[PDB]
Each structure stands twice: as structure tokens, then as C-alpha cells.
Amino acid sequence: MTEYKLVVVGACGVGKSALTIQLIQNHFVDEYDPTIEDSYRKQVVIDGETSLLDILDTAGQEEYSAMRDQYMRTGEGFLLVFAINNTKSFEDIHHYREQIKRVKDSEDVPMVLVGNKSDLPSRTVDTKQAQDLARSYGIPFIETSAKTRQGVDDAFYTLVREIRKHKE
Numbered sequence: 001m002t003e004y005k006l007v008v009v010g011a012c013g014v015g016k017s018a019l020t021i022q023l024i025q026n027h028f029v030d031e032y033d034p035t036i037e038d039s040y041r042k043q044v045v046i047d048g049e050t051s052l053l054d055i056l057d058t059a060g061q062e063e064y065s066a067m068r069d070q071y072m073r074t075g076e077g078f079l080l081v082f083a084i085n086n087t088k089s090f091e092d093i094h095h096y097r098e099q100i101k102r103v104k105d106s107e108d109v110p111m112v113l114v115g116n117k118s119d120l121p122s123r124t125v126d127t128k129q130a131q132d133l134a135r136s137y138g139i140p141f142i143e144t145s146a147k148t149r150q151g152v153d154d155a156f157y158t159l160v161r162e163i164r165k166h167k168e
């Protein structure tokens with residue numbers, strides 16, 4: 001059984017914890033403590049092949065940390081999470097990708113762009129902007145809602161497909 005280290009990254013309040021808790025414990029958490037940074041394990045079947053996922057839900061301060069570079073270097077795939085009603089979180093995705101690329105001295109790290117809070121009728125980031133950004137990056141884009149569970153397994157299974165493609 002192949003083991004994969006997944007890292008969930010994105011601005012404060014985009015739903016990093018909510019998506020990770022939906023995937024693992026199948027429930028939506030409205031007030032998850034913003035400081036808690038934890039790892040979760042889950043066995044899943046993706047395209048008829050089982051993998052053990054080890055998912056790091058990131059938290060902490062907006063700061064450079066030579067210790068954060070260490071966790072990031074071990075990550076084999078990343079979810080770049082933005083919220084559709086927060087343009088700043090979508091503008092922030094470029095910075096997050098540049099930091100992942102810097103720490104892994106490469107331009108082809110498995111990544112998935114994730115547009116979270118798709119259940120909200122209030123939208124500031126257009127789907128065409130996110131499709132075009134994922135298009136220039138060469139990565140998939142997955143629309144999700146941690147609240148309704150829409151696209152949640154899809155975002156993580158797609159990241160696994162990306163890691164599997166990269167490792168061949």
C-alpha cells in the first residue's frame with residue numbers, strides 16, 4: 001500500500017480544517033480553533049488502488065519558519081485552498097505556490113487548486129479566473145463546500161491522482 005503525505009494550505013479562514021475534518025470524520029465544524037495544526041491518517045481507494053493518506057492541515061502565523069520549510073519539503077502533494085467570497089485568499093494562492101516551489105527546488109510539485117465555500121451565494125472570485133489560473137499552473141481545479149461535502153473527496157482523490165502521475 002503506497003503512503004502519500006498531503007498538505008492543505010491556504011489563507012486564514014478559507015476552510016482548511018473544515019475540509020480535512022469532512023474527509024476524515026464526515027462532519028462539518030463551524031468553529032474550528034484556528035491555531036490547531038494537526039496530521040490525520042485515512043486509508044482510501046482511488047481508481048481501484050488503495051493508498052494511506054497522511055494529511056497535514058496547516059495553521060499558525062503568516063511568517064517565515066525554517067521549521068515550516070521542513071514539513072513542506074516532506075509533503076508530496078498540496079491543496080491550494082481559497083474561498084470563493086474572499087478575493088484576497090485567491091490572490092494569496094500565487095504566494096503559496098511560490099513558497100512550495102522554493103522549498104522543493106522544483107516547478108512541478110503535485111498541486112490542486114481548491115475553490116472552497118461553493119455553497120455560498122455571495123461570490124467574488126469568478127470560476128473562469130480560477131479555471132484560467134489552474135490552467136496556467138498546469139494543475140486541476142476542484143470546487144468544494146466543506147459545509148455540504150460537495151467536491152470534498154474529489155479534491156483529495158484528485159490530488160492523489162496528481163501524485164501518482166508525478167511519481168511514474
Ligand SMILES: *CCC(=O)Nc1ccc(-n2nc(C)c(-c3c(C)ccc4n[nH]cc34)c2C)cc1
Pocket residue numbers: 009010011012013016034035058059060061062063064065066068069072096097099100103
Ligand atoms: C488562520 C490560520 C492559518 O490559516 N494560518 C496560516 C499559517 C501559515 C500559512 N502559510 N504562509 C506561508 C508563507 C506558508 C508556507 C508555505 C505554503 C510553504 C513553505 C513555507 N515556508 N515557510 C512558510 C511557508 C504557510 C503554510 C498560511 C496560513
Ligand SMILES: Nc1nc2c(ncn2[C@@H]2O[C@H](COP(=O)(O)OP(=O)(O)O)[C@@H](O)[C@H]2O)c(=O)[nH]1
Pocket residue numbers: 010011012013014015016017018019029030031032033034116117118119120144145146147148
Ligand atoms: N459556508 C461555508 N462555510 C465554510 C466552509 N468551510 C469552512 N467554512 C467556515 O469558514 C470558517 C473558517 O473555516 P476553517 O476550516 O476554520 O478555516 P481554516 O482557518 O482555513 O482552517 C469557519 O467558520 C467555517 O465554518 C464552506 O465550505 N462553506
Ligand SMILES: [Mg+2]
Pocket residue numbers: 016017018032033034035036057058059
Ligand atoms: Mg484551521
Ligand SMILES: [Mg+2]
Pocket residue numbers: 137138139
Ligand atoms: Mg501539471
